[PDB]
């Protein structure tokens, strides 16, 4: 006769009313019981272990949340913040971030049992900060709000590093260490963080895709996840090239800062990013029409005639250069810089 | 759903304090032989195993 009971007791008849009112949206009953009941425990839990704040945040009750957050006795405020970030409730996040525990952006990045939800364990893994969770769930407004308060995702160390915290973690638990490294990379490799966190997101996304493709071979386990993170880092750049409408935007995505880069070799653009997209094997960035239209103009450089010709005419000019090859060799030998040189 | 290594050792292996230590300095593979006898293939082909 066993049961999973997360409290293993019986609720009062004046606490089941408070939990039903907090869960199902009864705002006047919460206003009445939160002022005219001094023997009430606001941290009472239901059959699963959720108090009134974790039942009002999970149901999107902004008025009950703003009514309960003025109590200065609540527990599980960091878990309510993580649950509202997970579900995507922007008004509940902006109401919880005004509680006086996130005053100067204190707990928003990088032991304390603040984000616990059960008195044994947390809802997400212990590494997950609000900014990593807001970048996992692709919440652009929550990522912008948390970046406005100075919260960043710390880039993990090298796989073979030997710092005097990288060895204590690997001696305590070598499972949660690898899981924490992959959660930090999953937060770093998302478009919500890549587009809002950096100044040049194309360069950052290319270097991050190369780094994840290197770690997919160095770290043999979790390979099928680093491949996915590198694939979505490439998909960010390919979907950013697609939005270009002028030719200055095409030249700003394919080529870097034009005014602070070398002119190249000839009257043709600087192909330094576009060789890096071939070295790093970003195939859809190079096989995109907005890139082929640039590369064909360098391929057919001084040839306006042969560009628009059909097939079985270029075979004939191949045979024509096959016949008269030493004559063109003599032309290039003696007289370069001409109409043929 | 396991996140630590004690949770992995509690799912793959049984109650550690009330089971034999095994043969060497290695865990008790009595549930994990039963998952091979009963032909539970995705429990044995999981990365945590």
């Amino acid at each position: 006769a066993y049961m999973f009971s997360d409290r293993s007791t019986s609720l009062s008849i004046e606490e089941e009313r408070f939990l039903d009112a907090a869960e199902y949206g009864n705002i006047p009953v919460v206003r009445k019981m939160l002022e005219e009941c001094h023997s009430l425990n606001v941290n009472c839990v239901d059959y699963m272990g959720q108090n009134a704040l974790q039942l009002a945040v999970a149901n999107e009750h902004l008025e009950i949340t703003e009514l309960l957050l003025k109590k200065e006795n609540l527990s599980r405020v960091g878990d309510a913040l993580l649950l509202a970030i997970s579900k995507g409730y922007v008004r509940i996040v902006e109401a919880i971030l005004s509680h006086p525990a996130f005053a100067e952006g204190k707990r928003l990045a990088t032991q304390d049992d603040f984000y616990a939800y059960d008195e044994d364990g947390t809802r997400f893994s212990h590494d997950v900060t609000p900014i990593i969770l807001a970048a996992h769930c692709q919440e652009y407004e929550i990522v912008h709000t948390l970046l406005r308060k100075g919260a960043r995702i710390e880039r993990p160390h090298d796989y073979f590093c030997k710092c005097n915290d990288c060895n204590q973690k690997q001696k305590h638990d070598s499972f949660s260490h690898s899981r924490s490294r992959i959660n930090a990379y999953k937060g770093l490799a998302s478009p919500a963080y890549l587009s809002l966190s950096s100044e040049d997101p194309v360069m950052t996304a290319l270097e991050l895709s190369n780094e994840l493709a290197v770690l997919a071979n160095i770290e043999k386990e979790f390979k099928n996840d680093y491949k996915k993170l590198s694939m979505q880092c490439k998909d960010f750049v390919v979907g950013l090239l697609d939005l270009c409408r002028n030719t200055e935007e095409v030249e700003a995505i394919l080529n870097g800062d034009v005014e602070t880069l070398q002119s190249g070799d000839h009257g043709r653009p600087n192909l330094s990013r576009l060789k890096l997209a071939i070295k790093y094997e970003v195939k859809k960035f190079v096989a995109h029409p907005n890139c082929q239209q640039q590369l064909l103009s360098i391929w057919y450089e001084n040839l306006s005639g042969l560009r628009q010709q059909t097939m079985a005419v270029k075979f004939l000019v191949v045979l024509a250069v096959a016949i008269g090859l030493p004559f063109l060799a003599l032309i290039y030998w003696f007289a370069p810089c001409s109409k043929m040189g | 759903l396991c996140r630590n290594t004690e949770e992995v050792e509690a799912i793959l292996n049984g109650d550690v304090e009330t089971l034999q230590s095994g043969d060497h300095g290695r865990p008790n593979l009595s549930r994990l032989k039963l998952a091979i006898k009963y032909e539970v293939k995705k429990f044995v082909a999981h990365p945590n195993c």
Partner: peptide
Amino acid sequence: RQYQKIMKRLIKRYVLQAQIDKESDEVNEG
């Protein structure tokens, strides 16, 4: 002991994640 604590937290994770996965099915006409 420790095994009952670990199994209780894993059963709670399974129930919460199963309700989350049930709230990801497409909404039907009923």
